[PDB]
Write an enzyme that holds these catalytic residues in place. Structure first.
Site, PDB file in Angstrom:
ATOM      1  N   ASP A   1      70.605  70.446  42.260  1.00 54.95           N
ATOM      2  CA  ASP A   1      71.591  70.746  43.290  1.00 54.95           C
ATOM      3  C   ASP A   1      72.812  71.414  42.661  1.00 54.95           C
ATOM      4  O   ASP A   1      73.297  70.972  41.621  1.00 54.95           O
ATOM      5  CB  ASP A   1      72.008  69.460  44.007  1.00 54.95           C
ATOM      6  CG  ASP A   1      72.679  69.711  45.344  1.00 54.95           C
ATOM      7  OD1 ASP A   1      72.061  69.389  46.381  1.00 54.95           O
ATOM      8  OD2 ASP A   1      73.822  70.210  45.379  1.00 54.95           O
ATOM      9  N   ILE A   2      73.306  72.463  43.302  1.00 51.62           N
ATOM     10  CA  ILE A   2      74.476  73.169  42.789  1.00 51.62           C
ATOM     11  C   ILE A   2      75.765  72.349  42.942  1.00 51.62           C
ATOM     12  O   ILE A   2      76.757  72.603  42.256  1.00 51.62           O
ATOM     13  CB  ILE A   2      74.627  74.534  43.482  1.00 51.62           C
ATOM     14  CG1 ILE A   2      75.548  75.445  42.665  1.00 51.62           C
ATOM     15  CG2 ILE A   2      75.128  74.369  44.902  1.00 51.62           C
ATOM     16  CD1 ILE A   2      75.630  76.882  43.159  1.00 51.62           C
TER      17      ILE A   2
ATOM     18  N   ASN B   1      68.386  64.570  55.082  1.00 48.44           N
ATOM     19  CA  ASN B   1      69.387  64.696  56.130  1.00 48.44           C
ATOM     20  C   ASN B   1      68.857  65.487  57.313  1.00 48.44           C
ATOM     21  O   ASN B   1      68.223  66.524  57.136  1.00 48.44           O
ATOM     22  CB  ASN B   1      70.639  65.387  55.597  1.00 48.44           C
ATOM     23  CG  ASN B   1      71.331  64.594  54.513  1.00 48.44           C
ATOM     24  OD1 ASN B   1      71.279  63.368  54.502  1.00 48.44           O
ATOM     25  ND2 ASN B   1      72.002  65.287  53.608  1.00 48.44           N
TER      26      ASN B   1
ATOM     27  N   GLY C   1      74.425  65.118  58.289  1.00 50.82           N
ATOM     28  CA  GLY C   1      75.077  65.927  57.273  1.00 50.82           C
ATOM     29  C   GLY C   1      74.177  66.959  56.622  1.00 50.82           C
ATOM     30  O   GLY C   1      74.392  67.318  55.468  1.00 50.82           O
ATOM     31  N   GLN C   2      73.174  67.434  57.354  1.00 48.46           N
ATOM     32  CA  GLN C   2      72.255  68.442  56.827  1.00 48.46           C
ATOM     33  C   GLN C   2      73.001  69.743  56.552  1.00 48.46           C
ATOM     34  O   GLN C   2      73.578  70.342  57.455  1.00 48.46           O
ATOM     35  CB  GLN C   2      71.092  68.684  57.795  1.00 48.46           C
ATOM     36  CG  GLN C   2      70.040  69.649  57.261  1.00 48.46           C
ATOM     37  CD  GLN C   2      68.851  69.827  58.190  1.00 48.46           C
ATOM     38  OE1 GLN C   2      68.763  69.198  59.249  1.00 48.46           O
ATOM     39  NE2 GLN C   2      67.923  70.686  57.793  1.00 48.46           N
ATOM     40  N   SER C   3      72.955  70.184  55.302  1.00 41.09           N
ATOM     41  CA  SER C   3      73.768  71.311  54.852  1.00 41.09           C
ATOM     42  C   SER C   3      73.072  72.654  54.982  1.00 41.09           C
ATOM     43  O   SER C   3      73.734  73.694  55.087  1.00 41.09           O
ATOM     44  CB  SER C   3      74.166  71.098  53.394  1.00 41.09           C
ATOM     45  OG  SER C   3      73.021  71.076  52.564  1.00 41.09           O
TER      46      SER C   3
ATOM     47  N   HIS D   1      64.769  69.503  52.990  1.00 44.00           N
ATOM     48  CA  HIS D   1      64.902  69.240  51.563  1.00 44.00           C
ATOM     49  C   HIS D   1      65.073  67.757  51.288  1.00 44.00           C
ATOM     50  O   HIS D   1      65.754  67.038  52.029  1.00 44.00           O
ATOM     51  CB  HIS D   1      66.065  70.058  50.947  1.00 44.00           C
ATOM     52  CG  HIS D   1      67.385  69.921  51.651  1.00 44.00           C
ATOM     53  ND1 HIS D   1      67.650  70.514  52.868  1.00 44.00           N
ATOM     54  CD2 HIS D   1      68.529  69.297  51.283  1.00 44.00           C
ATOM     55  CE1 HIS D   1      68.893  70.246  53.227  1.00 44.00           C
ATOM     56  NE2 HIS D   1      69.445  69.498  52.287  1.00 44.00           N
ATOM     57  N   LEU D   2      64.412  67.307  50.234  1.00 43.06           N
ATOM     58  CA  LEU D   2      64.501  65.940  49.762  1.00 43.06           C
ATOM     59  C   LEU D   2      65.482  65.864  48.585  1.00 43.06           C
ATOM     60  O   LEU D   2      65.257  66.505  47.559  1.00 43.06           O
ATOM     61  CB  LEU D   2      63.122  65.447  49.342  1.00 43.06           C
ATOM     62  CG  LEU D   2      63.076  64.034  48.758  1.00 43.06           C
ATOM     63  CD1 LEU D   2      63.252  62.990  49.848  1.00 43.06           C
ATOM     64  CD2 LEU D   2      61.772  63.825  48.013  1.00 43.06           C
TER      65      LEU D   2
END
Ligand SMILES: O=c1[nH]c(=O)n([C@@H]2O[C@H](COP(=O)(O)O)[C@@H](O)[C@H]2O)cc1I
Lengths: 112, 115
Positions: A29-30, A85, A91-93, A98-99
């Site tokens: 993750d960035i 999410n 809070g899905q970005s 994605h897990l």
């Protein structure tokens, strides 16, 4: 698909890739929230878990097994937290399923 | 007693009461006894697996099924603004019951980081 995770899958922008196979990709993750924080995503563009189909079941499970194996490879022997999410409350970005896998520190409760 | 004697094994065999949402041949969904959100339930396999770190490759479909059931139950419970799914693995995950399970939390804004 038509998200930044689509671009990462297509190798159009960089990410630190941990693992890949024919149907998923794992990468750091960035914006990490723990000393180890990576994502496992399907190459199939499923926008969110709420619209996943029944025949996607094994694929979704595959994300978890890949997450498990990557966590072990990254030395998360004391455990970790997996997160998916959904939507605004979740809070899905990014609207590509994605897990999250987070570890390397004590995870707390509640989980957000 | 197939499925073992964790509290969750006992719930599966109806030996300990729980507030059940959904049941099929592979899993069981029930409300968490200590909710961390206005809606907070668990989806658990009927097959006993202690934790994700020891899940087998052939458990893939089952693990995915937990998520599909989680998302279907969330819809049935009217969580139309979304929700968060969580697996707590081992000590750093804060795991307290060693029978694999998925949390589904919703009905409020969830925050980042997820603990
Ligand atoms: O009889 C029970 N019913 C339950 O719903 N739970 C929940 O299961 C969870 C166990 O913690 P864990 O961190 O997910 O392993 C926690 O949210 C408990 O409130 C735990 C027991 I023991």
């Amino acid at each position: 698909g038509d998200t930044i995770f689509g671009k990462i899958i297509r190798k159009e922008i960089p990410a630190k890739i941990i693992f890949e196979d024919d149907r998923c990709l794992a990468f750091h993750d960035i914006s990490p929230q723990a000393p180890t924080h990576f994502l496992v995503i399907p190459k199939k563009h499923i926008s969110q878990i709420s619209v996943a189909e029944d025949d996607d079941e094994s694929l979704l499970g595959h994300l978890m097994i890949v997450g498990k194996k990557c966590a072990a490879d990254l030395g998360l022997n004391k455990g970790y937290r997996m997160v998916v999410n959904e939507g605004s409350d979740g809070g899905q970005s990014v609207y590509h399923v994605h897990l999250h896998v987070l570890g390397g520190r004590q995870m707390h409760w509640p989980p957000g």
